[PDB]
Every structure is written in C-alpha cells, then in structure tokens.
Amino acid sequence: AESNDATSICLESISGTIKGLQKANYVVEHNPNLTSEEKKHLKQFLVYRYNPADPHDQPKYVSYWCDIKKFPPMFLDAILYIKNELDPTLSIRRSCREGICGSCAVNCDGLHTLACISGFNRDLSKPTIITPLGHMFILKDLVVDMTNFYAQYKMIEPYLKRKTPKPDANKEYPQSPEQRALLDGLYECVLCAACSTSCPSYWWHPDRYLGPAILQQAYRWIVDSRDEYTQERIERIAEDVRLDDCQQIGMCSFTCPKGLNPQLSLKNLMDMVKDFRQKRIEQEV
Amino acid sequence: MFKELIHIFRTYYITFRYLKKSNINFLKNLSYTLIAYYLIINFQ
Amino acid sequence: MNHSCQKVFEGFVSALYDTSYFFRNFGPFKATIHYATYANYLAQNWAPRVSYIETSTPAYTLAKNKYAVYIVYGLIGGALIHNYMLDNKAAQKSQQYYLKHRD
Amino acid sequence: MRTKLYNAAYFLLNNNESFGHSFGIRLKIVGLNTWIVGYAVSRYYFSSLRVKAAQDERF
Amino acid sequence: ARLWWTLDPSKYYLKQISSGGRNEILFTVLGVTAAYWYFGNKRCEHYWRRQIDNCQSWSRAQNINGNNLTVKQY
Amino acid sequence: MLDDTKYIQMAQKFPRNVSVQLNKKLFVTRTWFRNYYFVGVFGIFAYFIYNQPKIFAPFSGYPTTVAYKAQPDFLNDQVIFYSQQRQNTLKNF
Amino acid sequence: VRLNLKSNVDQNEYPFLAKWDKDMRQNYEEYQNRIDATTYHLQRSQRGIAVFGEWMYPRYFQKDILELEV
Amino acid sequence: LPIRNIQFARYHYLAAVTVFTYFATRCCLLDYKKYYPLASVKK
Amino acid sequence: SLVSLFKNTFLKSRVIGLSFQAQRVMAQMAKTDFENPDEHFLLNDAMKYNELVFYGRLAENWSINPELFGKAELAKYNEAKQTLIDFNQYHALVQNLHEFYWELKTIYLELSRGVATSNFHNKREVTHSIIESDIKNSIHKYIQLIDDLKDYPEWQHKVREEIGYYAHMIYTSVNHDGNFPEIFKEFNKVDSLYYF
Amino acid sequence: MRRIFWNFKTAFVGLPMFSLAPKNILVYPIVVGVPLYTFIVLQNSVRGFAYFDEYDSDVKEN
C-alpha cells in the first residue's frame, strides 16, 4: 500500500539540498585519536568513500594522515598504502602500475589523470583530495561505471575493414613510413576516459555525443591507410551530434596524461565531415 | 541561427530532449512563417 | 502513486491516446493531414527563390536562370516607383479638383 | 532499486584556462542575444502599461 | 568554441526545380499585382476625402436596444 | 561510391508483419512534454509576433469610431444625444 | 497653463459644476506633465534622420498619438 | 558547386535580419518621455 | 476525356519518377538510427522523401485508366505502384520501431531527470514501483521484438544497437538490489553481456 | 540527505564564475550599444535638447 508522495519528496529534496550546501564536503576522521602535534609530520588525504550496496551508507570524505616517507611519490602508491595499512576496504582499479593499462584514472586532486604516474603535493599543509571520475556513476569508492564508455567504443567498429582483396596473401598490407607516422601519437590511447570525463559536451550529452577518446579512435581508423572504409566511417560519425556536439574546448588535450592531442584529431574529423558533406553534392553530378 | 538556438536548448535542458527532430522542424516552419508574416505586416 | 489514482491516471492516459489515434487515423482526417503535410512541405522547402545551386554547364542553362534576379528587381522597383508616381498624381488631382470646386 | 549518483565534474575540477577561454566566448554570445531579446521584451512590456489615472478614481 | 555565423544560403533550400530555376518570375508577377491592387485601394481611399461638419452630419443616438438615448440629471 | 550493401539489403528485405505495442502512458507523457515546450516556450514568441504590431499600430485595427453631441432637456432634466460615425484617424500629431 | 487648484465656482448654487471643476483642476497638473512628456517625445522623434525619425514619423508613432489623445 | 546569385542571397538575408530586428526591438525609434524632465524649454 | 488524360498523366509521371528513387530513400532511412529516421531528410537533403510519403497514398488509392496506358507502360506502372506500396509498409515499420525507441528513451529521460544535478527539488533515493513496472514491460516487449526479427539478422542487429542502448543505460542507472534481479531477468541473458 | 562535494573557491563553478561571467556577458552590450545608443540619442539633438513648448507653460492663471 502506497500513496502520492510528490509533496514529501519535494520538501525533502529542497531541505536536503539546503543542508548539503551548509554541510558540503562532509569529512570524517579515520583515526580521531591523533595528537595535533603528530599531524605536523603527516600529510592529509581526503578520500571519497561511498558504498551504495550498504543501505545505511552515504557519500563522505575520510581523512587519512600518512607519513609520505614510507612509500613512493605517486597517487596510486598513497592510495594503496592507505588500503593495505590503514583500511583494506578501500576500492580502486589498478593493473599496470606504470601508466599503460589506464585503469587507475581518477580525479587526483582536482585533475582527471592516471593515479599511478601522477605525483602529489609534497607540502604537509595543503590537503590532498582523491575522488572518482566526475560525471561517471559511482559503484564503490573510486570505482565508476565505465560501461557506457565501452559501449560507445563498440559503435565505431574499431577493426580494419578492407574492400580490396590482398594481391598475394603471403605479404603484409603495404604502408610507407609516412603513412605509419601519420598514426604516431594517435594509437597510444589507453582508453582511460580521463579526457572524456573532462569534456563539458560529454558532461551534458553522455549518450548522443561520443567522447573525445572514442572520436579520436574513429579518426585513427579513418586516417589509417590500410582500411578502405574511409567515407563510410566519416558518414557514420556524422550522424546527429555524435561529433557535431564538440565545441573545441580543448580540455581533452590538456588532461591527457599520455600527452595525446584529441582536440586536434576532433578538429581534423570536423574538417573531413564538412568536406564529405560538401563533396557528396559536388562530386555526384 | 535558429539551428544554434535549438542546439543550445537541447544540449543544456534535459526536458527539451523530449522533442523529436520532427517537432523541431515543425517549430522551425512555424517560426519562419511567423517571421515572414511579421516582415510583411509591419510595412502594412 | 496511490493505486486508485493509478487506475484513474491509466484510464485518462489511455483515453487521451485513443482520442489522438482516432482523430489522426480517421479516414477523412487522415486524408486531410496527409495532404496538408505535403502542402506544407512544398511551401517551406520549395518557396520562390533567387539563389540556387547551378549544376549545369553554361551551354545547358537557360537565359531565364541568368537574368531572373534582374527581372525580379526590375519588376519590384518599377512597381514601387510607379506607385509613388501614382500617389503624387492623385495628390495633385485631388488638390486641383477640390480647389476648383471651392476656394 | 537505489538509484546511482555521481559527483558533478565542474564541482571538483581545478579551474583551467581552457574552460575560461571557451565559456568566455559562449557567454559573450549568450549575453548579446539575451540583451537583444530582453530589450525587445522590455519595450513591449513598457508599451503595454496603462495610462495614469486620477486620484481616488473608480473605473 | 566553434565559429558558426555566416550569411551564405544553406544547401538544403538551394535546389532547383526540374524544368529550370525556381518559380521566381511567376510569383513576383503575383506579388506585384497584389501590391498594385492593395496600394491602389489605399490611395483611392486616402486622397479623395473631406470632412463636412454641419447639422446634417448628426443623427439621433440610440441604445443597443434601439430606443433613443437619454440620460437623466440624477 | 559508399559501400551501402547491408543498408540496401535491409531496405529490400524487411518484415511485413512485425509490430510492437506502445505503452500509451509513455507516448502521452512525451507528447505532453512536447505540448509543454510548444505552448509555454514557442507560445511566447508566437504571441509576441502576433500582438506587438497590434500594440504599436493600434489605429489600423479599429477603423470606425463614434462621436456624440449633447443638448439639455430642461423641462425633463434629461440630456439628448446625437451620434455620428467617423473614420478613426490620427489627430494632433 | 498652470491653473490654480481652488475652483472659483459656487458650490451652493451649482454643486456638480463646482465638483467637476475641482476635480479637473486637481488632476490638471499631473495630466499636463504627462501630455508635455508625450509631445516632447513626439517632436524629438520627428526631428530624427531617415529611418531613425522623419521617414517614418507620422505612421509608426501611433501608440504615442493615442496616448496623447487619451 | 556554383551558387547562382550568392551575393544577392547574402545581402537579402542581412536585410531581412536587419529589418526584423529593427521592428522587433524598435532600436531606432526610442522613447524620450524619460528625458523630458532633463530638457530645457523654449517660448 | 481530357480530365482523365491529365489525371492519368500526372499519376504516371509522379509514380514512375518516384519509383526510381524509392531504393535510395529507403536505404537512407535504414542508415540512420531510430530516434529520428527522417533526420537526414529534414536536416541535410530531402531526396524525394516527402514526395514518396505523399504519393504512396495516391498510388494505393487513386484509380487507373488502362485504355490510356500502353502495354509496357502499364506493366511499368504496376511495378512502380508495388514499389510505392512496399515503401509505405517499410515506412510504417520504421515508424513503429522509432516510437518504441522513443518509449525506452522516455523511460531513460525520466531516470536522468531524477539523477540530474540541477534536480534539487525532485531528488528520489529509491526507484518507485510505476517506473519499475514500465521498465519491466518495455524490456519484455523489446525481447519479444528481437525474437520476432530472427529471420533478418541486419534488422535484429540494428534494433539491438539502437533500442537496447537505452535499456543498457537504464541498467547502469540503478543499483543491483531490491527487485533488480527480477526486473532485468530477460535483459541479463544476452543483452547485458552485449553492452559491456 | 543529499551530500554535495564542491570546492567553492577553486572549482570552475565558484568564485571564478563570479570573476568571469559578468565581464564576458557584457562585452557586446557595452561596446556596441553604448556607442550605438549614444549615436541614436544624439543624432536627433543636432541643435539641442530643447522642448518646443506647445502649451503655455509660462502662463499661470491670475
């Protein structure tokens, strides 16, 4: 048995918003039994914690005071020190430890980046805040739901398609060093989604607009000389706002920890789409 | 111009996502008709 | 919502959907909508115009399509100027008539 | 089913020069168009006002 | 941000008809004829007018009920 | 030429008996959101276009007006009115 | 004209004629200020140049004329 | 590719925008009733 | 019969001319997604789309006068009429799929408005029963549709890729507790694995 | 209970917005309208802002 709850829900929503604004950045000390003298020698990490599986848990910062002279100087090292030594219930993805897998992408103190190859402010006064990627649903602690990112990646058909049979089948698709260097700086993406989680167009329209990373992959498969579905890929990415929604903010190239330039790739894709639209009229006549 | 206004409203307002491209086109046609009527009538 | 209000709401939305569907798909109404949609398309996407894409070699394009703009401008400007001259002539005629009739 | 939630990125990203540079242009255009439309609406509104009436007048 | 302002016509509306250019002269003829008629009527009404104010221009007023309008000195 | 093979096949061969029932409630919800964004958003623009000329050009909408002359009626304490039709025109530029 | 607010009619012998004059004189100053503002607007607009003014003075400043008459 | 009378189209669109804005905003036909208190008088 | 001559000539011209274009229009409609299948025709170029939509009804309904037709001409007209009828049915099918897609997108939009950051006034922690029932029935209908398209691999694949996208997003919008196992029982079989 | 995490003073949506938005929204308004409005107002007043008094303002009833 249930009844209409528009009024109760509305009042609760407004009141909760006001209170949260009053009590934003809620913080709970991991170990309150710390003399303020000791905290002079220890740096403070504010780690976002949230366990939606537990019905009684709510998001909150947890404060950990750690001696930075016990582990190497990287965000992942500090996170794992906290997990192993202080609280082993902390959750985070980590495979490669050398910035290759791209699993550890998190909001390392105000900037999306891989936690394994990013240092942290050594100063003991300013606190460090570690939170998950911004606009991604949070599963537990620093683990977000990147499923939609992969689903979008699947829609670009990232596999070499060729319309012309190989002449002899005992050779390799010819490609000069120039047609290979055309891909240099473009195939190194590790699909970390750090850039795409920083693109405002991706904030507003996660589904209709592919991220900067996926569009960069489409560009990689387009510029590749061995594939023959150039126009087909261009047309496929030209639908609705799969690409048109990009506003050339340029944050994608700024955040990329690998040093890639997805902004330039998207710009080239836009130019190619414009030329495709024009010459669909100019050529066929 | 009109296209840009519609694009901004679609990208910023979640509710406006409900409208199809067909409804947007109908609004476009009505707006063009009203603009033509306005231009013509003001000179009468 | 309350399941009684749920029944009422489901009935109401079903009635709205049925009314809309009937009105749209009724024979005469369907024909009217179908013809008016195409009329609107013709008006919006095939309105008179002065600029259009030229896909024909100069040998395969009529003279009308090279001087249509000039003909249109001539017509409109001539209409405006002739109306102005007619207004002046009518002003003079009225003034003279009412003057000769008295004072 | 407890709906999932997320932390809006713009609430937790250090302010950057790219955001500023691009949103500056967007806000310039937004301000221009809003100013034009608001001026039109203001003229309409003020012209819609009634004429001043006498003191203590009914109808 | 991306630049988008331009005065160029859109290719969506730039098509021609099969038999040649769009119906421009045919519609302009109609427009000119309609303008001629409208402005001729306006000019004829405007210029041939005078205001004659004398006793014969006044008639007895009446209500919407048709009766003669008279208001008491209440 | 674009390799539209699969799309050509889809167009040529499509089922002619497959249909899906539509939840009336959700259809109605979307359509009424559309009506909300028409009446309450585009309605502003449409009403402005329709009315603003009628606010800045009122004289062309009321062509004929009436004028009155009055005389006393002493023996009955009445007032006698004579009406007159006029063409509503500008005055005192 | 800056008419005085004190009516010169005799209230004992012409009550309604006195009340009408009193109200007219009471509101005359305010309505005169409004009329002056409207006329100033009209003439200044007529002093304009081309589209900003004369070219379209009489015909497009209709609401102002209506307000002036009212 | 060639567009017949493209320049005419550009100028027509510009003129349409200008006229519509002029009538909608009445930018050129301001109101001076607000300035009357701040103006001198003759006669 | 002069009027008959003109009617038949008009019908022949329009129908035969459009029949040569039906392939292109139908292919383009297939190429786009189900959110706005006529998007290309509304935004980029109306490749005789509205003409086909209008003249399909005339081909179906308006009569013919064979004595005004030749032999090969009459055969060609019958072929073109059949092509236009095929286009009518194809458009009806695409419309049905598009409306089902918009049903699913409406459900997703309600969820998104629920979890929007600006939604300071209508924030709900726990999904209510009505939307849960809507999700369950929508997914049931979607599974039935996928089954009904077993003879058309391309159509089945397109229906998955297009419509099931929002089913997957709905899947991601909620936690895996409460009635979640039952609501997404059918979705968990194959579709959930596809969207990973 | 809605818990909001927000860097008020450093996040892009915060004090930086107060510093940025007002100076960018009013760019075209100022630089265009102010010269344009000045031109429109002054072009009437080639000789002066004189009100040609059509009514006897200097005349006061005795």
Ligand SMILES: CCCCCCCCCCCCCCCCCC(=O)OC[C@H](COP(=O)([O-])OCC(O)COP(=O)([O-])OC[C@@H](COC(=O)CCCCCCCCCCCCCCCCC)OC(=O)CCCCCCCCCCCCCCCCC)OC(=O)CCCCCCCCCCCCCCCCC
């Ligand atoms: C005087 C002449 C007459 C004037 C009035 C004329 C009115 C004409 C008809 C208007 C019809 C409007 C409704 C139809 C349009 C579509 C609406 C829609 O999307 O429907 C669903 C959508 C609701 O979606 P939802 O799912 O419930 O929301 C969750 C979604 O995530 C939400 O997702 P979303 O992105 O879709 O939601 C955004 C949503 C906005 O909705 C929201 O989500 C929140 C709305 C409330 C926000 C309140 C402020 C929050 C705090 C911000 C900071 C403020 C600081 C102030 C102090 C500063 C100090 C220095 O945006 C809109 O509503 C779009 C249209 C907005 C403009 C048109 C309406 C203007 C109304 C102005 C008067 C309001 C009443 C008087 C108020 C003042 C009384 C003293 O909207 C509604 O149903 C509500 C409609 C708006 C109600 C009024 C709220 C206040 C708005 C004030 C705006 C002021 C602008 C400045 C100029 C004002 C000049 C007058």
Ligand SMILES: CCCCCCCCCCCCCCCCCC(=O)OC[C@H](COP(=O)([O-])OCC(O)COP(=O)([O-])OC[C@@H](COC(=O)CCCCCCCCCCCCCCCCC)OC(=O)CCCCCCCCCCCCCCCCC)OC(=O)CCCCCCCCCCCCCCCCC
């Ligand atoms: C948070 C709470 C906030 C509360 C705010 C409350 C505000 C209350 C306002 C009350 C009404 C004021 C009206 C002023 C009228 C001014 C004109 C005038 O005197 O006309 C005479 C008027 C006749 O008007 P008219 O001549 O026919 O036409 C007037 C038009 O404006 C055309 O005249 P014009 O041709 O002379 O026009 C001049 C020209 C001038 O334009 C220009 O050239 C622009 C120049 C701009 C320069 C700005 C410089 C700023 C410097 C910035 C520097 C930044 C540096 C940063 C550096 C950073 C570091 C690097 O155009 C404009 O003025 C543009 C106006 C259009 C506005 C567009 C935007 C509209 C939407 C946004 C509104 C604001 C939203 C704020 C939200 C805030 C949220 C937190 O008749 C009168 O005698 C009326 C006098 C005014 C009183 C009217 C009373 C009405 C009462 C109604 C009942 C309800 C009242 C409710 C009150 C509620 C109170 C809370």
Ligand SMILES: CCCCCCCCCCCCCCCCCC(=O)OC[C@H](COP(=O)([O-])OCC(O)COP(=O)([O-])OC[C@@H](COC(=O)CCCCCCCCCCCCCCCCC)OC(=O)CCCCCCCCCCCCCCCCC)OC(=O)CCCCCCCCCCCCCCCCC
């Ligand atoms: C004037 C006063 C009277 C007006 C009466 C209006 C009556 C309208 C009733 C409509 C009823 C439903 C019609 C359904 C469609 C049936 C016909 C059909 O399918 O088309 C056959 C035929 C060929 O169609 P198609 O084969 O599909 O070709 C298109 C394909 O894309 C294939 O293209 P293609 O490349 O193969 O080339 C084929 C070419 C072939 O086209 C032609 O051959 C037609 C060329 C033009 C006419 C040529 C003949 C001229 C002489 C006629 C003499 C008639 C004498 C009558 C005597 C009667 C005595 C009792 O097609 C075209 O180019 C189509 C032209 C469309 C023109 C649309 C005009 C829109 C603007 C109208 C207003 C303009 C106002 C401007 C004001 C500006 C002021 C600054 O097209 C037409 O019949 C065109 C009709 C266009 C106008 C219809 C709508 C008019 C609405 C006016 C606005 C009224 C608003 C009032 C307020 C609203 C509430 C009342």
Ligand SMILES: CCCCCCCCCCCCCCCCCC(=O)OC[C@H](COP(=O)([O-])OCC(O)COP(=O)([O-])OC[C@@H](COC(=O)CCCCCCCCCCCCCCCCC)OC(=O)CCCCCCCCCCCCCCCCC)OC(=O)CCCCCCCCCCCCCCCCC
């Ligand atoms: C139930 C049915 C369904 C209802 C649905 C609901 C909505 C209603 C729908 C009703 C259907 C009609 C709707 C209206 C048409 C909409 C068109 C549209 O949206 O097109 C967008 C579309 C936008 O395309 P775009 O890519 O953005 O490019 C636009 C650019 O502007 C590019 O433009 P452009 O460059 O191509 O130019 C266009 C062209 C268009 O103009 C024309 O060619 C047309 C001309 C006028 C023809 C008027 C014919 C009117 C006939 C009326 C007959 C009576 C009807 C009575 C009916 C009664 C009922 C039966 O302009 C010109 O020709 C420029 C002429 C300039 C002349 C300059 C003069 C110079 C004088 C000096 C000479 C030289 C002197 C030298 C001295 C030197 C001294 C030193 O427009 C176009 O491309 C077409 C051009 C624009 C046409 C506008 C026509 C408006 C008509 C409104 C009629 C309202 C009637 C209301 C009646 C009410 C009765 C109660």
Ligand SMILES: CCCCCCCCCCCCCCCCCC(=O)OC[C@H](COP(=O)([O-])OCC(O)COP(=O)([O-])OC[C@@H](COC(=O)CCCCCCCCCCCCCCCCC)OC(=O)CCCCCCCCCCCCCCCCC)OC(=O)CCCCCCCCCCCCCCCCC
């Ligand atoms: C207040 C202002 C009002 C005016 C301005 C309005 C402005 C706003 C736009 C309004 C738009 C919406 C209009 C309302 C919707 C009307 C829907 C409708 O008709 O429903 C029928 C429709 C049934 O027809 P269906 O289901 O489509 O057809 C199967 C049937 O079994 C029947 O099968 P069937 O084969 O036995 O009969 C087929 C045919 C009767 O068949 C015939 O007897 C032959 C009819 C003519 C065929 C075309 C020959 C063209 C030859 C060349 C002409 C060249 C002229 C000069 C120019 C040359 C250079 C270009 O009957 C129809 O379906 C008539 C439909 C309307 C005319 C369609 C023809 C369009 C083209 C010709 C006219 C336009 C000029 C084009 C010139 C350029 C051409 C390239 O549904 C209804 O029964 C609904 C009834 C209730 C609603 C109201 C009904 C009103 C009826 C009006 C009749 C007007 C006849 C034409 C008068 C012309 C006077 C000059």
Ligand SMILES: CCCCCCCCCCCCCCCCCC(=O)OC[C@H](COP(=O)([O-])OCC[N+](C)(C)C)OC(=O)CCCCCCCCCCCCCCCCC
């Ligand atoms: C007559 C009525 C007049 C009333 C005036 C009211 C003015 C309202 C101005 C609103 C500005 C914009 C924010 C609200 C609308 C957002 C719409 C939108 O699209 O956003 C969606 C998005 C949120 O949604 P999202 O981020 O989830 O994006 C959608 C993503 N999907 C689709 C995946 C769900 O943006 C926001 O809503 C951002 C909100 C930012 C709020 C900032 C608040 C600042 C408060 C400053 C207070 C200063 C006080 C100073 C006091 C000083 C004292 C000395």
Ligand SMILES: CCCCCCCCCCCCCCCCCC(=O)OC[C@H](COP(=O)(O)OCCN)OC(=O)CCCCCCCCCCCCCCCCC
């Ligand atoms: C940015 C996005 C949004 C953009 C929106 C754009 C909107 C465009 C609108 C275009 C149409 C404009 C129409 C203008 C009508 C103005 C009417 C008005 O209020 O005028 C003022 C009027 C008094 O004027 P007047 O009688 O002339 O007196 C002065 C004469 N010298 O005042 C009065 O007479 C007062 C009484 C009438 C007004 C009543 C208003 C009631 C409001 C109820 C609000 C309810 C909701 C409350 C929500 C909060 C709850 C906590």
Ligand code: SF4
């Ligand atoms: S685009 Fe840049 S940030 Fe994104 S996955 Fe590739 S390298 Fe990493």
Ligand code: F3S
């Ligand atoms: S950050 Fe964002 S919108 Fe475009 S170019 Fe770079 S993606």
Ligand code: FES
């Ligand atoms: S931990 Fe290996 S790349 Fe992040």
Ligand SMILES: [Ca+2]
């Ligand atoms: Ca290639």
